């Protein structure tokens, strides 16, 4: 029951959790003297789903979506408590600061004016360092090119960052972020971690028949494009090109390339550009511009 | 052969075996890479970059056959590449 | 005297000084000696450290127990009193800044490259009134402010007229307000990072304290308001490189071992990041005592690993290139802030690298304009401007790295080397070494590179040599030791300078193979390569063997175009 409503209710499900964890927090330690958030990782079921695939459905309970990131913004502090200072009597004052980001439920919106002047109407100055400050991101991410169906548009979602994982985040990396589809539509991202054809065991059987013949390579690269004529050992590199390299990473030095580059001239009779279609079409992923 | 054949046959040989070097087929690229530092009087330049690419492709010879090392042939192969693609 | 700080304010009392700086030190005693006496310390230390905007308006009243005449200022206490007694002042990073600091002291390490002109900034405006008397002050804190033209004084409270206020620029009081951009230092960036900025906001008496072109240490809180700046085993381990035997050659081969042979080349390398002796006469004349090397060379052998390992070997090394923003990479250019109404001054690759090694690659796929400032800093140190908006002179001590190409791509024995290299008499006539690294091919002599190239692709280890190569730290120590060295030349080695110039300029003083002249330049380039010998054996005198070595290397520099 409390995994279902953990899966079904976190803002009622969450805050008691946390609460606890700085009650164990509290009472963990005896020394004299801040809250304490969660984390959650393993499989999902359902909820963990492509971008494109997230739609107006289960919006209170959490989502598990992995992709890949294309902005980052700025790293932006901001005021949850603002102090200051009293010079006619030397006082000091504090107010704080409440929005729609910082709990999981929607509290009753309270609109605090920054203090421009005192209760009793004398000046005053801004405590700059007492006051905390939290930093804030704004990332997005949308799905990954090779588990989407290839030829139609990624949708992506922007996330909501807290002060503690604002280092944790760079554009061109496959991201998998776990959040809570919030609709003031956008997910809290609490967890982030940063990190197709699937194999049967008759076609292993027959990829290992075929490893120990003499006349494999060039039947394989004779069977690519059978709509062009010639050209045996272009296709060959070509063969030798999408298959790869092997990305050799030296100890305590720079990393060695292992990718290999091809570029192709000549007169424009032949299919160059109908070689870039089959490439595209034929690789495990790929990118034509 | 087929069109969902080689993309499983690719995949596998790039998460399974990786190829190391082995005698054999160190000294052949090294007498090829010294007789064509022929092509700098006659057709084209030749750069230390083309040392490493002519083992990537030799590599990948012998990662197309899956073996667990390298191989004379996949030298040889790329030699015959490299006549290709140079004259 | 007696009572310093009471002694600071009958100073303030005779109108002779305007700044007031308060130490932490004097702090830390005054809390030894309450704690000493049994009486409560009630912590100062704990409490200055965070929110010190409320602590230079809270302590001024206290000295003071619009009208102030002085400027209150801070500084932090060192290392050496933190580990007496047993943090609040550590050298902070741009990209250790957490976000969470924003309001502690800092204290950040680094170079700066954008300046601004100081400039007048209110604090408190003064409205002056025919009606009543009554001048009101009103505090400004944001960048923007409104004119207040209704009069908010005690007399036009109770009254039907509300006449005319006017504001005067006298009574106002202003600020010497100046902004700056701080940089990440070189070495402290990660790997694969960049170094970026940061804006620091000073005030007051501190706004001439900072010239562009140097490292800083700043001392401030952060909103960066600045308070105070400044400007500046291991024995073991350089003791056993020493005991080795052969040090110079030792630490020839150390550096970039990737690469095949070439020992005098790299060798020169290594007595052009060692930099050498700057001598002043003391009567106004500054010679220049470092090394600017040019590397000619066909295609085929590796030319940008070497640049790069020397720039990633010394400190404060700056990749260039040729073309793309080059023209505006090498000059200090103009632009508009976005931050705010001015323009600022944007600074080439000439003045984040100050004090090193500043490295051209496609040295002949540049301009005139590129030419015109990299020969004036390769001649004296200072950069001289004549444009619109700036008008300043620059310090700037580089040694410069040239990596170049002949005319066709590779060399020409037909061809005399005043027509293969298309740079002019005077850049080469300044240039003292001169590297035509030319590829010949042999049958013997490329198997070993062939054999080298192969072992480093297999695996990531060195070959099998009775020798282990020596990390960066270790010969960064062994140079920065060796820099604070002062050779003095002998007589016995004189006889055979002047001797070995006097037949040398004979020698120079014109045919098919010829190329250049002697000059007095590469005369004072050899005394500079002596005087880096002598360094590099830590030496206090300049010996016979440091000049037999050194002709040697500059005349098999050009000995390999007979091969």
């Known amino acids: 029951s409390f995994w279902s409503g953990i899966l079904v209710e976190p803002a009622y499900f969450i805050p008691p959790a946390e609460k606890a964890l700085t009650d164990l927090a509290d009472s963990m330690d005896d020394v004299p003297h801040h809250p304490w958030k969660l984390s959650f990782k393993g499989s999902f079921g359902a909820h963990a789903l492509s971008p494109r695939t997230l739609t107006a459905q289960h919006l209170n309970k959490l989502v598990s979506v992995e992709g890949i990131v294309t902005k980052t913004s700025l790293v932006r502090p901001k005021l949850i408590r603002s102090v200051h200072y009293a010079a006619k009597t030397g006082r000091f004052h504090y107010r704080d600061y409440t929005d729609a980001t910082t709990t999981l439920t929607t509290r009753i919106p309270t609109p605090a004016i920054y203090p421009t002047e005192d209760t009793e109407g004398n000046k005053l100055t801004t405590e700059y360092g007492y006051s905390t400050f939290i930093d804030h991101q704004r990332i997005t991410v949308q799905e990954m090119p090779e588990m989407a169906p290839a030829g139609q548009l990624p949708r992506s979602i922007d996330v909501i960052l807290d002060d503690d994982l604002v280092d944790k985040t760079k554009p061109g990396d496959r991201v998998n972020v776990v959040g809570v589809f919030k609709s003031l539509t956008l997910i809290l991202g609490n967890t982030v971690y940063p990190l197709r054809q699937m194999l049967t065991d008759f076609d292993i ?85 | 052969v087929t069109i969902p054949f080689l993309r499983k046959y690719v995949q596998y040989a790039k998460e399974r075996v990786i190829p190391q070097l082995t005698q054999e087929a160190i000294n052949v690229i090294v007498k090829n890479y010294t007789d064509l530092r022929d092509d700098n009087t006659k057709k084209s330049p030749i750069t230390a970059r083309t040392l490493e690419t002519l083992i990537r492709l030799a590599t990948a010879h012998a990662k197309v056959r899956l073996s667990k090392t390298v191989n004379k042939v996949d030298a040889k192969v790329a030699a015959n590449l490299l006549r290709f693609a140079l004259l | 005297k007696g009572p310093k700080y009471m002694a600071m304010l009958q100073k303030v009392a005779n109108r002779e000084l305007n700044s007031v700086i308060i130490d932490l030190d004097d702090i830390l005693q005054y809390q030894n000696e309450k704690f000493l006496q049994g009486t409560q310390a009630d912590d100062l230390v704990s409490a200055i450290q965070q929110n010190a905007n409320h602590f230079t308006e809270l302590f001024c009243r206290a000295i003071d127990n619009l009208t102030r005449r002085y400027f209150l200022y801070f500084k932090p206490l060192s290392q050496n009193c933190a580990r007496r007694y047993r943090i609040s002042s550590k050298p902070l990073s741009v990209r250790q800044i957490k976000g969470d600091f924003l309001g502690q002291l800092i204290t950040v390490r680094g170079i700066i490259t954008r300046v601004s002109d100081v400039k007048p900034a209110v604090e408190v405006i003064a409205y002056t009134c025919d009606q009543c008397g009554y001048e009101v002050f009103q505090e400004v804190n944001s960048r923007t402010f409104t004119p207040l033209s209704e009069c908010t004084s005690e007399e036009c409270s109770q009254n039907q007229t509300k006449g005319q206020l006017f504001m005067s620029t006298r009574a106002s009081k202003f600020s010497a307000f100046q902004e700056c951009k ?375 520099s050009k000995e390999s175009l007979y091969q």
């Not at chain 3, 706004?207 to 308070?227: C, H, K, M, N």
């Not at chain 3, 060379?297 to 073309?323: E, N």
């Not at chain 3, 000439?350 to 040295?363: P, Q, T």
């Open chain 1, 205 to 289: 059987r027959n990829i290992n028949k075929l490893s120990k013949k003499k006349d494999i390579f060039d039947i394989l690269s004779q069977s690519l494009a059978p709509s062009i004529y010639g050209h045996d050992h272009i296709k060959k590199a070509i063969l030798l090109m999408l298959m790869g390299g092997v990305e050799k990473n030296l100890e305590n030095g720079s990393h060695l390339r292992g990718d290999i580059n091809i570029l192709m001239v000549g007169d424009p009779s032949t299919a160059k550009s109908q070689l870039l279609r089959f490439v595209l079409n034929t690789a495990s992923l790929a990118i034509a511009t």
């Open chain 3, 182 to 556: 701080i940089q990440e230092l070189s070495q402290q960036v990660p790997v694969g990072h960049i170094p970026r900025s940061l804006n620091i906001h000073v005030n007051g008496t501190l706004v001439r304290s900072l010239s562009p072109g140097d490292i800083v240490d700043v001392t401030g809180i952060f909103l960066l308001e600045a308070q105070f700046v400044r400007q500046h085993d291991v024995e073991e381990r350089v003791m056993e490189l020493i005991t080795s035997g052969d040090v110079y050659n030792r630490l020839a081969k150390s550096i970039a071992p990737e690469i095949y042979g070439n020992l005098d080349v790299k060798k020169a390398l290594l007595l052009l990041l060692v930099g050498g002796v700057d001598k002043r006469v003391g009567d106004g004349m500054k010679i220049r005592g470092d090394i600017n090397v040019c590397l000619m060379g066909d295609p085929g052998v590796a030319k940008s690993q070497l640049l790069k390992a020397i720039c990633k070997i010394s400190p404060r090394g700056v990749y260039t290139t040729g073309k793309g923003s080059s023209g505006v990479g090498l000059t200090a250019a103009v632009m508009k802030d976005p931050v705010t109404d001015e323009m600022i001054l944007e600074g080439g690759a000439l003045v984040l690298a100050d004090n090193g090694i500043c490295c051209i690659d496609e040295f002949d796929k540049m301009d005139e304009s590129d030419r015109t400032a990299i020969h004036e800093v390769m001649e004296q140190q200072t950069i001289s401007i004549s444009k619109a908006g700036i008008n300043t002179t620059l310090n700037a001590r580089t040694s410069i790295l040239a990596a170049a190409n002949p005319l066709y791509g590779r060399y020409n024995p037909r061809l005399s080397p005043l027509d293969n290299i298309n740079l002019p008499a005077a850049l080469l006539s300044r240039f003292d070494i001169l590297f035509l690294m030319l590829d010949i091919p042999s049958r013997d002599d490329d198997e070993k590179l062939a054999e080298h190239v192969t072992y480093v692709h297999m695996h990531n280890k060195q070959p099998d040599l009775d020798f282990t190569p020596v990390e960066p730290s270790k010969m960064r120590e062994y140079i920065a030791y060796a820099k604070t060295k002062r050779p003095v030349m002998s007589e016995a080695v004189n006889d055979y300078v002047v001797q070995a110039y006097i037949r040398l300029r004979q020698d120079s003083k014109d045919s098919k193979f010829s190329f250049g002249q002697a000059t007095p330049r590469t005369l004072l380039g050899i005394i500079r390569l002596s005087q880096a010998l002598a360094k590099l054996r830590l030496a206090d005198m300049v010996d016979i063997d440091d000049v037999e070595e050194a002709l040697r290397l500059v005349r098999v």
